[PDB]
């Protein structure tokens, strides 16, 4: 009768390799699975196929045609599913998008900009890989009884150096953060959330996609694959009984799925299981900023630093103050036209009790023209852009909850804080690397810091999701910038040095001196000769 | 037929709630279980009850009577187990003896020093809770076919503040690190190693031991209990359908065990599963020393520092140089009788412009010579105020943790693990045995530099020292605040950190790490992170 007998499982990404095996195996374990997808012919072909493979009654298989990106299509779809079945016992977030396969500078943002091998926009990649699971957890959760299971399917590569794969890998890093936070709020309901990290799984498709990554790098046959096989601790037998490092099967993923769906995992919430044959990859890239800053870096003379901000004007004031004492010129770009307004008002406060405030220009990720516009002005007036500090689009988080939240806010957090932050970086990377092919005599070196908002009573839940995205972006933006550097140097092209980046998290501090402390290191890190290795730099309570 | 059908499982720690429920459950999934233990009456008693409990044939159960601490006893026992059954499919490392329950100053080291409520030596607690699983993993491995599973059962509290529980919690944290490292070497044999972290599991027993922990900490009923329940993210239903935060059951733990013993987890190695109702605990408490030191802390005038080391003569010199410029006096106590030799040899080379400190034997094997060091310090240097503790040996004993002989592994346990807790406990007892105003004692444990091994023995050692520090701070805070209310004028509480330099192998990094050691011992502030990392620079 099977281990999931009588339970109702919803599986997204039913078409994909992994989604198909999860369906066949849950059917064999006695579940009624509903597969959800975008094309009505595709699901019906799959469901007939998955019925035939399982050897199961007809009413035990079902489908719902949905656009998992649209939360109102999700409300429609869930209501239909409930009305036939009453409740959902397992929710499996599979999400088969693979992302555009391009470097950070070359990522597509609009359909016109779309090309071969890059079939979705960035925002579509974010809405598929991070939005979809988020919307289900919010809408299905009121129909899941005490004892239910959410399963989120991530990848191992969301924490690994994965060349050219930012639109895929970054919303995955964000989803992990989403899972842990959803475990808190759904755990208080008796609903458990847990996560699977498949390694490289066996496919005909994955064979070609390691090749495209190999071609994007310099490197020959087998390169990306042999490297990850070598992080594997566990060898396995072949038919002759010899040991070997190979990829896991799709059935391995489904074993971990069944366990996490059945009542044999009833006491677990917030756990992760890496189906990788024990690929060993470093987990923590953090450190505390514990030392005093020492602004003896008047080396910032001539260099000019961009501040991407908006609505956080206390941070902008200190940031320009620090950077000016270093000798750096500052350009400041407010992301919403509103933020310019009360900033001009703040300088009006400055004119009382009075000396010059900096230049403010529009800098909007929705309208990537104004980013390119800012670069052009900087070349004519301030002699370039040499460093950037990037802030959250908003000062405060939209809501205290990750599950119990309206539809509009969640769509805004996706467009503003996640896609919009990637956009700024992708224009930065192309800027510095379209110029690196220019210089003749000798050049300085570019640096980036992402500086978060201060501690919040929410526990900074939305900020922490954003932080997980910024982290994995840096991991890959360092890696690409380095390989593009050494490669373009093989061309003999005297190129600007590769971009370095860090982020400073302020979540454990909410003091006025805490702000000045964090802004001074921002100025120190943008223009120092040395660098810090850790990706995330934490400022303590002090 | 069941999920472990035909599989041969050796289960240590067969008695007690978790070990028993694992035996009955493996029997229900069709395995033949061998339970391993110390008393033949207890094992034969265990086999009959669980034979009756499982409702399973007799030849399905078996026992081996052995001293799991003795590797020569293990060779005898495993070879015999193989002789009855041919092979081993599952190894479950349970152990779980609770250790002697005393504060670091009062922990027993010799049978005479044993007392009521403290029934094991320190070394015995280490030989049970860390060695046994280690020796099984080494000796059983040549009898485990490709596809086998090792399950190491730790506790969630191996990362927790547990007043009076150092002999328990410190070898568990060590065993964790040991598991990860062996996954590399056993993975190359086709063998899985994976780890279960039970939370506080429900018993009538744990009710009472939370009551005793409440009493030692001075805090009232439920204080220790509510503290762990409130970290739990996952609620569960009661019989009437209402939600509540309660502890997991014993069967919840055995569900995860069956998963990790069965071929449904065939692609897993180096994983951990926390059966905790989603207890939320901070994972990383580490930080990098990124700044340059600044020795304007002549606050060390009059204060005197003990250096515990041996065979690391370059650090011993760099340390005395650092500490003297701060104004501290230095005593050096070498851990091996060898270490005196080449130090006395090096100083003869220099003088044949350098004035060496007094160098004395200081051996945790013989805790008498520790009291000797304190005695000289009282007559001569006006006391001991700060300590630096270094590994008993500079170079790692072996490149492997599994393919390694018995003597080396036994020496590593005696010196680097039991011997390092020994030093800490006499330090804590010294400082706490003691009208106007007082200064404050400080400790830093300094690791060896980077190794071609990746420092596997160093990482096992460091993992224990980390949890050692957590509880040594915790006890010191409560021991202080309590004893001073009695009106006894005692020193302020001990603080400690460790400096791990495994990611650096340059001489300037060596000087950098020695400099931070001196600064941290005599500075007024303190660093909260327990583990302090020096980068490559």
């Amino acid at each position: 009768t099977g281990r999931l007998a009588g339970k109702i499982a919803l599986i997204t990404g039913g078409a994909g390799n992994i989604g198909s095996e999860l369906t066949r195996r849950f059917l064999a374990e006695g579940a009624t699975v509903i597969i959800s997808g975008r094309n009505r012919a595709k699901l019906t072909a799959l469901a007939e196929r998955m019925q035939a493979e399982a050897g199961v009654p007809a009413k035990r298989i079902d489908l719902e045609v949905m656009d998992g990106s649209d939360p109102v299509a999700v409300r429609a779809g869930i209501e239909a599913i409930v009305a036939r079945h009453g409740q959902i016992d397992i929710l499996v977030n599979n999400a088969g998008s693979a992302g555009a396969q391009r470097r950070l500078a070359e990522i597509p943002l609009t359909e016109a900009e779309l090309g071969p091998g890059a079939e979705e926009t960035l925002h579509a990649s974010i809405a598929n890989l991070l939005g979809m699971g988020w919307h289900l957890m919010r809408i299905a959760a009121p129909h899941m009884p005490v004892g239910s299971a959410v399963i989120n399917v991530s990848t191992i590569f969301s924490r690994a150096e994965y060349y050219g794969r930012i639109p895929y890998v970054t919303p995955k890093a964000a989803l992990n953060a989403l899972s842990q936070l959803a475990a808190r709020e759904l755990g208080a309901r008796g609903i458990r959330v847990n996560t699977i990290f498949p390694g490289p799984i066996e496919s005909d498709r994955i064979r070609t996609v390691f090749q495209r990554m190999d071609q994007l790098k310099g490197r020959p046959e087998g390169d990306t694959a042999h490297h990850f096989l070598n992080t594997m601790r566990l060898c396995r037998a072949n038919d002759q009984g010899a040991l070997e490092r190979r990829f896991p099967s799709v059935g391995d993923v489904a074993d971990a799925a069944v366990f996490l769906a059945s009542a044999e995992s009833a006491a677990l919430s917030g756990e992760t299981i890496e189906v990788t044959h024990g690929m060993e990859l470093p987990a923590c890239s953090e450190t505390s900023l514990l030392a005093r800053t020492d602004l003896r870096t008047i080396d910032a003379s001539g260099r000019t630093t961009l501040i991407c901000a908006g609505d956080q004007i206390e941070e902008v004031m200190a940031l320009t103050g620090m950077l000016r004492t270093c000798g750096s010129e500052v350009i400041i770009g407010f992301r919403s036209a509103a933020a310019l307004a009360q900033f001009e008002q703040a300088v009006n406060e400055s004119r009382r009790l009075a000396f010059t405030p900096p230049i403010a220009l529009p800098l909007d990720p929705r309208d990537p023209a104004t980013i390119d516009a800012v670069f052009d002005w900087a070349g004519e007036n301030t002699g370039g852009i040499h460093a950037a500090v990037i802030l959250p689009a908003t000062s405060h988080e939209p809501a205290p909850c990750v599950i119990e939240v309206d539809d509009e806010r969640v769509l805004n957090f996706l467009a503003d804080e996640i896609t919009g932050t990637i956009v700024i970086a992708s224009r930065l990377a192309r800027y510095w690397q379209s110029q690196r092919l220019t210089p003749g005599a000798r050049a300085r070196g570019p640096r980036v810091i992402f500086l978060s908002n201060g501690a919040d009573q929410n526990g900074n839940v939305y900020g922490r999701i954003q932080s997980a995205a910024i982290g994995q972006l840096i991991r890959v933006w360092r890696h690409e910038a380095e390989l593009d550097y050494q490669r373009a140097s093989a061309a003999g092209d005297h190129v600007l040095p590769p971009v370095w980046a860090n982020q400073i998290v302020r979540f454990a501090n909410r003091s006025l001196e805490g702000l000045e402390f964090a802004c001074a290191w921002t100025a120190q890190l943008l223009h120092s000769q040395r660098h810090i290795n850790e990706i995330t730099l934490n400022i303590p309570a002090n």
Side-chain angles (χ1 to χ4, degrees), chain A residues 1-37 40-41 43-45 47-48 50-295 297-298 300-348 351 353-426 428-492 494-542:
Chain A
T1 192
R3 283 172 55 227
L4 307 172
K7 292 181 83 180
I8 303 169
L10 178 61
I11 302 170
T12 72
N17 204 179
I18 293 171
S20 302
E21 173 86 44
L22 291 174
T23 302
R24 184 188 60 76
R25 174 67 180 276
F26 289 16
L27 290 172
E29 293 299 337
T32 299
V33 310
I34 302 91
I35 53 166
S36 186
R40 178 175 285 275
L43 289 176
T44 55
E48 277 178 345
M50 304 300 104
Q51 190 186 18
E53 298 170 356
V56 164
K59 310 294 283 295
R60 200 165 298 168
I61 185 61
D62 193 355
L63 67 91
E64 183 71 25
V65 296
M66 299 173 74
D67 184 72
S69 297
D70 188 358
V72 183
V74 175
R75 298 190 189 280
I78 290 295
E79 299 294 320
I81 293 174
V82 169
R84 298 190 299 281
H85 296 276
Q87 82 197 13
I88 307 95
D89 292 326
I90 301 96
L91 172 57
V92 171
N93 292 326
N94 200 18
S97 188
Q101 283 81 232
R102 287 177 182 176
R103 297 187 292 114
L104 182 60
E106 300 183 357
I107 298 173
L109 302 178
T110 58
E111 170 61 17
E113 193 178 5
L114 198 147
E119 294 79 2
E120 296 179 352
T121 58
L122 178 69
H123 183 65
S125 295
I126 302 301
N128 186 332
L129 291 172
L130 173 61
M132 190 180 291
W134 200 317
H135 306 302
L136 298 176
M137 284 189 279
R138 296 185 294 121
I139 297 165
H143 301 284
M144 300 178 74
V146 180
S148 300
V150 183
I151 302 170
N152 289 314
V153 186
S154 185
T155 193
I156 186 59
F157 302 109
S158 69
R159 78 192 194 189
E161 289 181 351
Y162 215 42
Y163 187 84
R165 307 297 309 282
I166 283 168
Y168 174 79
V169 182
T170 297
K172 291 286 181 62
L175 182 66
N176 305 341
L178 179 63
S179 293
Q180 301 296 328
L181 300 172
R184 279 181 186 169
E185 309 185 9
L186 296 175
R189 290 175 178 173
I191 301 165
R192 64 196 199 272
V193 184
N194 290 312
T195 307
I196 304 163
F197 290 18
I201 307 306
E202 286 290 332
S203 293
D204 60 358
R205 197 170 179 87
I206 188 172
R207 305 292 185 190
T208 59
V209 312
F210 278 121
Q211 177 189 3
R212 179 55 183 161
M213 294 174 68
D214 288 323
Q215 288 176 354
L216 294 178
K217 300 183 287 185
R219 283 275 232 127
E221 300 180 1
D223 174 75
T224 303
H226 287 98
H227 173 80
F228 286 109
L229 295 172
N230 285 318
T231 67
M232 282 183 179
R233 294 177 291 184
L234 185 59
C235 298
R236 298 196 67 176
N238 64 5
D239 282 336
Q240 287 77 22
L243 292 171
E244 62 186 354
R245 289 177 173 85
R246 59 172 169 78
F247 309 116
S249 74
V250 190
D252 296 331
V253 179
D255 290 324
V258 175
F259 178 77
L260 290 175
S262 72
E264 298 151 356
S265 70
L268 305 179
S269 184
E271 185 60 34
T272 304
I273 299 167
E274 300 176 2
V275 186
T276 69
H277 292 169
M279 282 172 70
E280 188 182 357
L281 299 178
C284 268
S285 178
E286 273 179 337
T287 189
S288 283
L289 290 175
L290 292 186
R292 63 177 293 280
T293 188
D294 190 4
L295 292 178
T297 68
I298 297 175
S301 53
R303 295 185 68 188
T304 168
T305 303
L306 183 68
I307 300 168
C308 313
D311 202 3
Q312 308 91 2
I313 293 172
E314 290 188 353
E315 280 77 354
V316 173
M317 298 298 177
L319 285 172
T320 179
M322 303 297 173
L323 288 169
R324 285 188 178 179
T325 63
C326 285
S328 177
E329 186 69 40
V330 312
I331 301 163
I332 297 169
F334 286 105
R335 290 165 68 189
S336 67
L340 290 165
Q342 87 277 14
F343 175 76
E344 285 182 350
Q345 300 303 110
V347 173
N348 292 324
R351 299 204 310 272
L353 303 169
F355 175 73
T356 60
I359 187 63
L361 309 178
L363 180 78
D364 191 359
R366 295 190 184 276
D367 192 3
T370 174
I371 298 174
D372 286 329
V374 171
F375 297 121
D376 277 325
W377 187 86
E380 292 180 353
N381 299 107
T382 63
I385 292 296
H386 295 84
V389 190
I390 305 171
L391 277 61
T394 185
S395 58
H396 31 263
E397 293 181 345
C401 300
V402 172
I403 296 296
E404 189 172 2
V405 290
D406 56 353
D407 283 319
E408 73 171 1
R409 286 177 184 167
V410 181
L411 300 170
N412 291 322
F413 174 72
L414 268 299
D416 290 332
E417 303 300 339
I418 289 165
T419 66
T421 296
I422 299 176
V423 176
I424 303 167
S426 68
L428 287 166
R430 193 175 69 202
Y431 178 73
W432 279 328
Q433 290 186 355
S434 68
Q435 286 164 343
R436 72 188 178 104
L437 295 170
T438 60
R442 202 281 317 279
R444 175 60 182 264
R447 303 283 168 83
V448 177
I449 287 288
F450 307 41
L451 174 66
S452 82
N453 302 120
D456 194 349
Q457 292 294 324
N458 310 124
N460 295 107
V461 297
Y462 281 92
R464 291 177 190 271
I465 302 164
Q466 178 173 6
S467 162
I470 291 165
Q472 179 55 29
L473 179 64
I474 292 167
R475 189 181 302 273
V476 173
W477 184 17
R478 296 181 183 182
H479 180 198
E480 292 194 359
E482 174 66 28
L483 289 177
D484 298 338
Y485 176 68
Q486 292 171 357
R487 190 171 180 178
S489 301
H494 285 87
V495 293
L496 189 65
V499 174
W500 198 253
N502 290 289
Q503 58 164 344
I504 303 159
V505 176
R506 298 179 59 194
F507 292 162
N509 180 346
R510 191 65 177 169
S511 74
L512 289 71
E513 59 273 11
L515 191 158
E516 283 187 349
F517 179 73
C519 289
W521 275 103
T522 303
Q524 172 143 348
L525 285 165
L526 291 169
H527 301 277
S528 170
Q529 286 288 105
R530 298 188 183 282
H531 74 276
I532 292 174
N533 285 319
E534 281 77 0
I535 298 169
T536 293
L537 308 174
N538 286 302
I539 72 169
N542 191 352

